[PDB]
């Protein structure tokens, strides 16, 4: 069969993945979308603020960077939505279905924008 | 000796001798008649 | 000669495994199974890379595409002088048998075969492309 | 003169060009000894430079505003004003040699086609035959024309392979 | 100076014409592929047999001629 | 316990010119003679492919052994010519008197068709072509002081060349070693470690201690070369040597009584560069080769041959067996004693990597007198030995794939290191694929980021020292550690090994020989370009080796061979799947990567190291513009290629005008190659059909049928012309530049 | 699926069948040649277009011809 390897087949690694929102079955797709969106949204603000074109402005740097992070989350939400449209047109997990993914994309937008907003509040 | 003279008759050997001769003739002509541009 | 029936419980060669094996296609579209009898345990080369030991008696392998099965068949037949046969297996559980289609390898002429895609003319006697134009689809003069 | 050109012997720019080249050589000369090996070589170069500029002027070439010789290619203008040696005469000089080489090679290729194994006579040259054909090629223009008139120069259209059409 | 450049331009026109004209006159077939017409204007090749047939279609003659056109222009 | 012994066969082959008159005799296919022009190319392509002429390993080994004598004989003719031309057509004797003002020259051209202008004014009342091979510096270091000494070496070189050709004939036609002789790997290593490298190092130490050191000590003191004692007078008269080095007054007793400290005067550990000549101390170099001699002589007694003591290489390999690697190194010994290609793959890899290491160490630690201040020699030697190393490494990939196709046998390799590597090749190539994409974005993307920011008038947004910074902190730490090594970690060394680490510059004849090299943001960016282009070259070559036998596209690629064009247009198209084509593609990337390496070296040295020393300070050739300009692609185009190519394009009418011609000619050959790379033989075979028709019409059609080159030969012809044109273009550009200003 | 055609110049050498790496071709009885057999192409849906069969045909011009056509998972030679 496939080449067995500790990275591919280990107990500690398997348990960690099984607890991630993507692999945690039994949770509504919308809730998983919010949980995933919040994590990525919070991180997405970092690089924009520190290395953006308005990074050296004292107070505008925080606003401009976070506002650009919010924009990228919006674009990503569109990518999630159209992916579901193309992939699911006609199985065990509800997420991998036309109904499930549409809820998942909506949750990501809500969670992602909340994470970006929450990141801004931490700064000020 | 027949085979050796046959080897000298191979295409690469003939070309080397022929162009060595041809080049030498042209080089020698330009040594005694330097800078020919017009028949005159 | 009758169409053989595949035995899914046939033992497989001694192979550690590799990254050149089946992919998600096998679980969704199809895969191929090759089986043969081995006179003695011997080392052969896997078309997917590496070396495997064939058990004495029946052996069974699964491959991702037909060409891989027929590549192993050429090795076993030409070098080790065996006589393998392989199938096409679908995810629904159906099994299709081929090579040898009628039990005799195609290189050897056998009565009962019906000629297919045989044109009783030369290549130089085909019509010009203009005469097969607007036939509903791109058609070569050889097709008609 | 022709096309607005002037004889190099009467060209101001042509004369100035010679001084520039000699001046460059003289500048390098004064860093050596009188009769050292480098000095002798440089003096030899200067002699050839002076001879070259005298020969081109003596040849009656035409120089442009650049002060460099220009050649006349029209046969009518060349023969009219005595420039036949620039292009016109060398034209028939080259063709004789070019036809000589081509005619000799064609004779050899025909000669070995009759042999049992023509291919082995091409990688391994038949030197005695090649030398024989090399000397007889001096009269190629006469032999070439006679083949044309007798109709043995060209193959028949029916003996040449061609693709479907 | 204009003499040399003009003759280079002639080389470009004649060579580009050579490639394009060969691509058209040999489009219907050749000794290496007598029945090229049965494959169409644009196909990859006829395989490595018969010595190799890379860039044998009439489409490929045009493809090679574009390089010479850019060089000429 | 097969004894190690000499084993030969008497008169294996007859010496006759019969086969010289039968081209293709070596191969069954070509022995029948030509029918098409393809036969001619096949004759030269397969001439040295011994492994395919015969299946007998013994016959293959005997041809390899004698073909190596021919290579040695050719090098001796080449070496003899270099020494001879130094004696008869050089200004070496004048150079010894005034090394800092006279340009080395050892080639003179005849006065024909006006080419005598290439005999430039080089100094010493001599006219000739300036050489960048560094032979004058090498001869001075060894102690050569007259053209007679150069002349005698050339005559000795020809005698050695004759001996090498006799040996090749003797050991093939008269006494050919048997296969069992060639397979004494333990014996060969013992002799090559202690005998070739070991005694060779000791013998050269003898020359340096007795000839080079005394002669160069007086030359540096200013003694006229003609008034220096001859090397044999130094050898016969211990009194003379005692004056230069008092340690010689005690003879060899200190060596045998272990009072080795007595020899401290000529066996030194100074480090650094000799201030007078700008090169390494020869006393340091003598102690180096004495130490190296002992290390290798000890190394040559490790393997067991005939007397029990020693190691068995097979036993070492089979003992190194771990939990993660299955069987382990089992089966490698049989692979490496029965496959010449496997041996060649390893040796080319390390021999090429060694040549690249030589380039870095020789510039940073100039080992010859007056080598450093001769910027033309420094640039040429570094660039020459980088190119040699690059080609050898690509060959290592080529002959690793040949082994994989021809000499690989699965039965001998089951669950060993070699087998397990093949079984996760997708994991290796997929990961190496991602690393290359990552390195391409984060190294070349930075240049694109800087170019766009600069064009937009946003210099503060660029990656640079005056902007967002990328400091090679790790490299800077190592530079400082080596600079302080003599204080604590190498107490008995007086100076640091190189002046690149830090300290003060050494100037010879008003020019900088070596000074500290600073690493900044530009150096950070260029280094990660090197890592990118090297990793890609590994990907192409390693992919070819791992997929030589089969892949998910061609499951039976081994049966097709090592060198085939494709498997047809099926499966979407299979052009260039053979392992030979991975060498063909790998050559382009090796050329791409080494071109940046030699551009990096050339610009960094001129900008930051090379220059003229004056009262105020050091003024560099390009005035320190590397730091601010080399962070954009536009900077390289304008400041490096456009500005420095001024010398080559203005060379007409001078002694350097030859480089101008080759600069254009190289550009031509390179562009000419794209005809073969961008086209296919299908077009050309049809073109020849119309051309053949014209010859048939005139009864002048050849008997050997014209054929367009094969698919593979088109790719081989393309890459060879591409490399020659590209490399020759840089060669002309470098020499015309550095000779003119350096 | 590609198109594979056998023409009446076949001499029944069987080389095309041996060369094919996907068992697309086979030999059938015939009366039009000395060998009394002709090549057949009953399984063109498995053809990949390698044209190894054309490389192996001795007749001039070829007696087996492959016309690349519509692509699919099988004809594109994919294992994924
Ligand atoms: C189209 C190509 C071409 C042409 C037409 C010429 C023509 C000429 N070149 Mg040039 N040249 C070319 C390409 C060409 N070159 C190239 C590619 C290079 C680079 C390698 C050079 C490099 C070059 C140099 C370095 C020199 C020339 C010179 C010459 C002259 C030689 C005259 C001679 O040898 O008479 C000799 C007389 C003969 C009759 C020769 C033929 C002998 C046979 C046996 C006669 C048989 C008769 C029946 C002539 C004007 C020379 C010169 O002075 O030019 C002004 C000169 O020094 N050429
Ligand atoms: C490649 C083509 C070509 C071209 C464009 C020219 C061009 C020219 N030629 Mg030349 N010529 C050529 C080839 C060419 N020639 C050839 C192959 C030969 C034979 C070897 C000649 C022989 C020749 C002679 C004998 C004369 C010219 C002359 C001329 C000039 C005016 C007449 C003419 O030819 O008109 C245009 C050209 C053509 C239509 C092509 C055929 C030209 C024929 C062969 C010559 C015509 C001469 C003309 C009747 C002279 C009348 C007196 C004139 C002062 C008006 C003109 C510069 C005349 C001249 O020197 O004028 C100053 C002149 O006397 N040519
Ligand atoms: C370093 C260069 C080198 C060396 C050492 C060899 C060595 C060899 N070549 Mg090779 N060869 C080379 C370069 C080289 N070749 C190149 C560049 C080409 C062109 C592509 C060829 C083309 C070639 C062919 C076509 C053949 C060889 C053959 C040989 C073998 C016999 C030669 C012999 O008897 O010489 C004897 C040498 C002398 C007596 C020296 C004096 C006479 C010479 C001509 C000066 C030998 C293994 C022959 C063979 O049998 O190969 C298996 C053979 O047929 N070579
Ligand atoms: C790597 C080997 C090598 C190379 C590339 C050269 C290259 C050269 N040599 Mg040198 N030479 C060499 C080895 C070499 N030599 C050796 C080993 C010897 C000792 C016998 C000599 C002895 C020698 C002499 C005596 C002369 C040269 C000369 C020459 C030049 C003209 C050669 C020529 O056209 O002859 C003519 C061509 C044919 C006969 C064919 C040329 C730069 C000549 C030179 O530089 O003159 C100024 C010259 O006089 N060489
Ligand atoms: C005059 C002496 C002599 C003679 C008559 C022979 C005769 C023979 N040898 Mg022997 N041989 C000799 C000397 C001789 N050898 C020497 C000196 C060596 C040591 C290198 C060898 C090594 C040797 C080997 C290893 C083999 C032979 C073989 C042969 C046979 C065929 C050789 C052939 O086709 O050569 C024709 C080849 C050439 C003329 C090429 C010459 C190559 C040399 C090395 C010059 C290289 C120049 C180099 C490329 C220069 C750069 C080029 C660049 C400027 C373009 C034949 C029985 C072969 C055999 O028996 O096969 C069954 C065989 O495998 N010989
Ligand atoms: C391989 C390298 C090498 C060689 C060949 C030499 C050689 C020499 N060294 Mg040097 N040396 C070396 C490395 C070397 N050294 C190193 C690495 C060091 C650093 C430790 C030194 C340090 C050193 C010192 C300090 C001294 C020498 C000295 C000498 C000389 C005399 C040695 C002596 O007393 O020998 C004693 C005896 C022998 C070596 C045996 C000789 C055997 C002969 C050749 C046998 C001949 C037999 C034959 C059949 C007879 C001819 C018959 C025929 C005519 C018919 C000698 C020229 C001494 C000298 O004079 O310096 C100027 C000296 O003082 N060396
Ligand atoms: C120690 C070095 C070494 C040795 C001994 C060999 C030996 C061999 N190699 Mg390997 N190889 C090496 C290094 C080496 N290689 C390197 C560094 C590379 C990377 C470029 C390769 C890449 C390589 C490939 C890709 C192949 C081989 C092959 C072979 C085999 C046949 C070679 C042959 O017939 O050549 C005959 C020689 C020629 C046709 C002459 C080539 C001339 C070149 C292209 C000229 C380039 C320009 C020139 C140097 C300078 C300008 C010239 C001027 C006239 C303009 C043979 C076992 C072939 C094989 O089948 O192996 C099993 C094969 O396919 N090698
Ligand atoms: C300048 C010419 C050029 C370029 C840019 C590339 C680029 C590449 N080659 Mg190629 N290659 C070239 C010439 C070139 N090659 C030539 C002439 C040959 C023939 C010898 C090859 C042969 C060859 C081989 C055989 C291989 C490559 C590989 C690669 C890849 C290296 C790793 C990577 O992904 O880097 C990152 C990509 C880049 C640096 C490209 C430029 C990226 C820009 C600067 C930033 C991105 C733009 C941004 C998103 C904005 C877009 C806006 C727009 C959408 C509106 C990459 C795609 C290797 C590969 O695939 O490795 C995985 C590989 O195996 N090349
Ligand atoms: C580093 C990894 C060392 C790994 C190391 O030392 O492993 C050690 C381990 C050796 O295990 P064994 O003790 O069983 O080996 C016995 C040996 O004698 C060999 O038979 O090797 C492997 O498991 C092989 C596969 C490693 C796979 C490594 C994957 C990651 C590669 C990363 C490459 C980075 C390159 C950076 C260059 C500067
Ligand atoms: C492997 C071993 C190879 C060894 C090769 C040895 C070659 C030696 C050649 C030189 C011969 O000379 C070597 O011995 C001479 C005789 O003792 C020494 O001669 C020295 O001592 C003599 C003692 O009477 C004096 O007369 C000499 O004037 C004095 O120079 C040389 O200083 C030494 O260099
Ligand atoms: C130009 C070209 C050709 C045509 C090139 C050919 C046929 C090579 C020509 C070599 C020489 C010029 C011909 C043979 C010369 C003889 C040795 C005779 C010479 C006699 C004297 C003049 C020396 C291909 O065959 C080809 C094949 C595959 C991909 C690209 C190309 C490609 O680009």
Residue numbers in the entry:
A (entry chain L2): 53 to 142, 157 to 190
B (entry chain J2): 1 to 40
C (entry chain D2): 53 to 196
D (entry chain F2): 63 to 227
E (entry chain B2): 516 to 588
F (entry chain A2): 10 to 751
G (entry chain C2): 2 to 81
In the authors' words:
Photosystem I (PSI) enables photo-electron transfer and regulates photosynthesis in the bioenergetic membranes of cyanobacteria and chloroplasts. Being a multi-subunit complex, its macromolecular organization affects the dynamics of photosynthetic membranes. A chloroplast photosystem I (PSI) of green algae consists of a core complex and three antenna modules: inner belt, outer belt and Lhca2-Lhca9 heterodimer, which together comprise 24 subunits.
Here we reveal a chloroplast PSI from the green alga Chlamydomonas reinhardtii that is organized as a homodimer, comprising 40 protein subunits with 118 transmembrane helices that provide scaffold for 568 pigments. We used 2D classification to separate PSI dimers from monomers in a reference-free manner, followed by 3D classification leading to a subset of 14,173 particles, which were refined to an overall resolution of 2.97 Å by applying C2 symmetry. The structure contains 40 protein subunits, 398 chlorophyll a (Chl a), 60 chlorophyll b (Chl b), 56 β-carotenes, 54 luteins, 2 violaxanthins, 2 neoxanthins, 4 phylloquinones, 6 iron–sulfur clusters and 32 lipids. Cryogenic electron microscopy identified that the absence of PsaH and Lhca2 gives rise to a head-to-head relative orientation of the PSI–light-harvesting complex I monomers in a way that is essentially different from the oligomer formation in cyanobacteria. In our structure of the chloroplast PSI–LHCI dimer, neither PsaL nor PsaI interacts with each other between the neighbouring units. Instead, PsaH, which normally preserves a monomer, is not present, and Lhca9 with its associated co-factors acts as a symmetrical linker between the monomers, highlighting the importance of the light-harvesting antenna proteins for regulation of the macro-organization. The specific interactions between the monomers are enabled owing to unoccupied positions of PsaH and Lhca2. The analysis indicated no distinct conformational states, but instead revealed continuous motions in the three eigenvectors describing a relative movement of the monomers in relation to each other.
